[PDB]
Paper text:
Examples include herpesviruses and most bacteriophages, both of which replicate their DNA as head-to-tail concatemers containing multiple copies of the genome that must be cleaved to generate unit-length viral genomes. The terminase complex recognizes a specific sequence or structure on the concatemeric DNA and cuts it to produce the free end where packaging is initiated. Each subunit of the hexameric ring is a heterotrimer formed by three proteins (pUL15, pUL28 and pUL33) interdigitating with each other.
Here we reported the atomic structures of a herpesvirus hexameric terminase complex in both the apo and ADP•BeF3 bound states at 3.5 Å and 3.6 Å. Structural comparisons of our structures of the terminase assemblies in the absence and presence of ADP•BeF3 show obvious conformational changes at the ATPase active center and the basic patch. Upon binding the ATP mimic, the P-loop residues R261 and T265 rotate to contact the γ-phosphate mimic, whereas the adenine base is sandwiched between the aromatic rings of residues W266 and F171. Additionally, residues E202 and E357 alter their configurations to make H bonds with ADP•BeF3. Interestingly, residue R346 from an adjacent protein subunit inserts into the ATP binding pocket and interacts with the γ-phosphate, contributing the third positively charged residue (R261, R262 and R346) at the ATPase active center like other ASCE family members, which indicates that residue R346 might be a trans-acting arginine finger candidate. Consistent with our structural analysis, the R346A mutant did not alter its oligomeric assembly, but completely abrogated ATPase activity, demonstrating it as the bona fide arginine finger. Our structures support instead the revolution model whereby the hexameric terminase assembly follows a sequential coordination, one-way revolution mechanism to drive dsDNA translocation.
Residue numbers in the entry:
A (entry chain C): 13 to 82, 96 to 129
B (entry chain A): 38 to 176, 197 to 291, 294 to 340, 348 to 432, 476 to 602, 614 to 685, 705 to 719, 723 to 727
C (entry chain B): 2 to 266, 306 to 403, 407 to 429, 485 to 650, 655 to 772
The structure:
Amino acid sequence: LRDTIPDCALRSQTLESLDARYVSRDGAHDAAVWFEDMTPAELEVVFPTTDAKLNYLSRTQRLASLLTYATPDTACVHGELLARKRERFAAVINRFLDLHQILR
Amino acid sequence: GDALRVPFLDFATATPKRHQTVVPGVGTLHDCCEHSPLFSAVARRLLFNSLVPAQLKGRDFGGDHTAKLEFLAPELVRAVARLRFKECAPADVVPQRNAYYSVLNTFQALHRSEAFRQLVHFVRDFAQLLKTSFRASSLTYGTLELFQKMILMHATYFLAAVLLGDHAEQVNTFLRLVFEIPLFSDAAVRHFRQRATVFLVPRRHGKTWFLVPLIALSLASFRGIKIGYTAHIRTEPVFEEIDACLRGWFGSARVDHVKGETISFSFPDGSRSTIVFASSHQDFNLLFVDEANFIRPDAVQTIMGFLNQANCKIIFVSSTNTGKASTSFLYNLRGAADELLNVVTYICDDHMPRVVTHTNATACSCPVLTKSAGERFLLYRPSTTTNSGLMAPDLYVYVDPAFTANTRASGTGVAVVGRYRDDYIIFALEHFFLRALTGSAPADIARCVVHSLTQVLALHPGAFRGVRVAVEGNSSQDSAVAIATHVHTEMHRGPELLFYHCEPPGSAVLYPFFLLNKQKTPAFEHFIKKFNSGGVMASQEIVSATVRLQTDPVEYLLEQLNNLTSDDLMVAVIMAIYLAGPPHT
Amino acid sequence: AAPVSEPTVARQKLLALLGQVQTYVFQIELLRRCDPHIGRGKLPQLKLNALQVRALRRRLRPGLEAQAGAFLTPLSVTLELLLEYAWREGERLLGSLETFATAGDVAAFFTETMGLARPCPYHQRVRLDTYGGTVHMELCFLHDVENFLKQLNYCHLITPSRGATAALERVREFMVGAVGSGLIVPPELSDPSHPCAVCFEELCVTANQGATIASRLADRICNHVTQQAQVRLDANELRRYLPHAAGLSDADRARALSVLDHALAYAISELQFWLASGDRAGQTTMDAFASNLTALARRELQQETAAVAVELALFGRRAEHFDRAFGSHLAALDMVDALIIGGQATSPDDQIEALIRACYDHHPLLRRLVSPEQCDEEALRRVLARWGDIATQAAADVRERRRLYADRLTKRSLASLGRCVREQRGELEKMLRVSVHGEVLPATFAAVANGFAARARFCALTAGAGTVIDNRSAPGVFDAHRFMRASLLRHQVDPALLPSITHRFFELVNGPLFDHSTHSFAQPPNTALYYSVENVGLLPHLKEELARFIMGGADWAVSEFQRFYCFDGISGITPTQRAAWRYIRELIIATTLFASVYRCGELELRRPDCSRPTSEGRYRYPPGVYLTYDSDCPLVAIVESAPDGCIGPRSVVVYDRDVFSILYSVLQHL
Ligand SMILES: Nc1ncnc2c1ncn2[C@@H]1O[C@H](COP(=O)(O)OP(=O)(O)O)[C@@H](O)[C@H]1O
Ligand code: BEF
Ligand SMILES: [Mg+2]
Ligand SMILES: [Zn+2]
Ligand SMILES: [Zn+2]
């Protein structure tokens, strides 16, 4: 039941070499389904909560999904959807403010 | 109950305790696994799939499991049984085991609640009695119609929240499963929890065939809960039928009743739930109002008073006929209400949308612009006189003339529109009717449009650099030209005035009229799309001289628009907007 | 009561493994935005996890392969998607971090990982390949995958098995890229205005005050294929968590808290361009929204400065994540483009509250808004109880029409006002809040693949096990087929049976997705088919030809001699379905007449889409004549299978293309 992290510990050895030498071998038993912890410490001091980490992960996703749609594909129907959604949300928030301005 | 009795599954992990959470059935997982409904809604259903009894999995569900939720191939189970985790942290094994077994003990304690045993004895007994189509079996199928399932959901989701309050989330999920409607937004399931809901079933569709089994099984399963009931003409058939079925599929020694009055079902204890009948005129919790279109006063007072209670759900299941479909007592309620009454109709709003709900009809018994867009349109109007910076500097005016008098289709339509942000806004409307036998119909029409424009100009001074005017010439080219000429001259008393011009076929002349033909379908198509998405609105200070002595101009326009499938104003509005090839000076 | 069935422990192990894989794919979606100088530090952990996923989807690869071919389940589908996407992203992130340290460029690494230069990998083709023509669409969004799956369930009675499996593989290959993240659902593929299959099922069921259901599917945000997850984030977040950080020396932690305490000591300008009606001078709602947004900007900038300072104190390096390495492209966006995306120190709920604390202030209408239940209650109570002159006249009429408009907005239309305000608030919340994912796509994918793989598995499983007496190869089967046809074309339909044909017809024209007739709260096949037919928008001139397709010596002998389930002549999607309906009605009426003339045995006219597997690999196909929807071997009659039920050594079956040949071979064998 020896774990994979205390099995191989050395220099780069590009991933396929490790796959060939350690786990693709048929003589192995394939125990040790223990994953590892990949999130760093410099990313926990500033986002110290799964909620805050998820919010930041969503903010950067919403930004990337704007930078890619801003060689001449020029239609990229996802881009037209993302422009229609923004131009709809703008009008909707403006009318939501204006209506309650009028209700007084 | 099988998935509740599972051992620890040691299952070591690397995430710090400051993040990990305890999902039931499984060990301790990172907090992200509680935010993703992809895994949460699976680890939550494979567990509640054990509380659901074996008589509520379906007709064909598998041997001894809900095979469409818990099925592992005979090769994947043998390849999974050889998977082994880190299995431990000796200083950290005991707390995780304690937490997991504590959550599972909470679940098991939920399994043993008497009030939950009653809800099970209700839903299981109902799905079992329904197998025989509610015959007199002591205890080809009896499929429920749609509303005959909505009534059951309305009763069960209420009595669940009333009898079992300390288990809101768990019983909510259990009922979502048992009705075979999982992945339902909690807004709908919450709507099921409401009281005082109204039904409207057509006769001979089945309302008493389903009520008396509902009444009988809401009596015999639950304990100590009364059940109201009221009708105008003295309920005797339903009462005798309830007596019959209860004495049939339960011990007749248990039922005790006096004719036309309280029926009571016995129990080992002194629970003795009752069906006291209020037809002949405390805590009821059902108050099944069986007829709600024929009530006499001094009998509505008990119903208005029971609304003051917090445990009664007055169900207004009342029949309709379609000869009196617009009941003087309920069909008006659909005006000012929100998720209160649900009609059971097969010929919907229009004269013949029946082909839509045709397949929905019982087998035994054998609008271009959306309303929301119209309500939003009239409901919200932007103030143009104070948001002039949002407007484009061009006005577009379309005149759709009719050159007759003393006719209902003799109205001239005029619209003055512009761009507002990237949307379109109406500044003025006219529905103008020639005085009979005037000598100057074009000038009368011109004076009407000029007066409208002027008012719009005065309300927004300095806003507009251009006004572009189209006079439809389909009716008469000469008469359209005459209108343009009078508009031209009168406006000569700043913004530049430009007319749309048309070079008629075979001609080299550019006339100041507009010919409506090939551009109609694109114009209408674009309008419908824009209007429906909230992109066309009316100015809060919209101008109209001709619609100022009987109805609101926007309300009037909307009545014409709702004929899309006298149209002068609709055409002018749609075409003015379409206009907003180059028109010129 | 001690031993629990081994499948239950295997399912618990699979749930734990799915949770671990989800955690790993969350760490991955984190390291795709972290500084490469830190990705190089976490390189060994990422390599170890990639090795783990590789060695993991080889112990489950034959298992999941056998599973896909036998009754897929939401757990298995979700696990396959997560394992495949985790493998993909692990290999890609490792490659992109090892490409770094050769270029040493951060902006390049971010344009690579976050996919800023990729050529839109969210396009796919299907090529449904039905009979009578092969219709091909293009999956782009998520609701498009949902629509295609519903379309396949609808036209399930024409498409063959292998074509359906090919289309379903090319759909799962797109779901791996879209539903693979399972946590953030990038906005390039989401259109909440499109209601999914469950919005219709929960709009048929909830209240409908008139308002034909086709008129309600236009306002719904559908809230199911992309949920909201309601993330909440405190104000002084890191200061709460810095004293108890992991692996920090007490001296460093103390001086870091000191630097934090010391350092603690949007596009608002573009609001005036918005259409703001009402009074211009004074306390208005647009100025209140501007002040709320300015306060939120102050909070976020303060948090960012504090974070930079504390990182300079603890590690000494101002880390460059995807919001600090692309701050040039950021901080230049408009008001709306900063509202949609933004607030790494706030939450979308904080933006919602900053808007609503500005709208709802100091006011009838708010009472209806806060509690609509009491509003409908009072409604029910009330129901039960019951040039110069031009300018001056313009000012006067605009005055008397603003007054009337405000009078309407305060007195009447309150139903419409409440509904519109609620819908606007919903359209706001669905746009701002963090969409995570939904549980509709794997559910429907499993529900459709189950039916198709079940048809294929029955076609392959009844191959042998006994006599396979075939009637598609015709020695003289004409002689015994025309006789039975003439013997059944003689009697009347006996309309006292139509309430059974009209049900056993919709029980076959239906699809495997919408059960709604085996729920144990079963609804008739009428509604069970109305769901699967109205969801996939059908022409109303076809919806009546479903209901009225049995009300009527022909019309139950429309098949030729050998070509019963054969659409060689016709082409299209509507006429192919019409011929399918003709053939199915013919089979049903033939079975009913055969029962009403001959008393040999029962047929019960079953379908292979039923017979879900038991605890392990057992199917027990009961006796009867099946439909099988296969143009190569449509009718399969199991005259007698076994004492247990499964197709065993004594399970003689009869293949045939010819319905009456089956009805004669059943009689001969029974
Ligand atoms: N889906 C159904 N399930 C069971 N019975 C049904 C169904 N549809 C119609 N029926 C039949 O309709 C009748 C019910 O009529 P009933 O509810 O008494 O009419 P009313 O609404 O006028 O009181 C019964 O004969 C019942 O068998
Ligand atoms: F359909 Be009835 F109440 F005669
Ligand atoms: Mg009757
Ligand atoms: Zn694209
Ligand atoms: Zn939806």
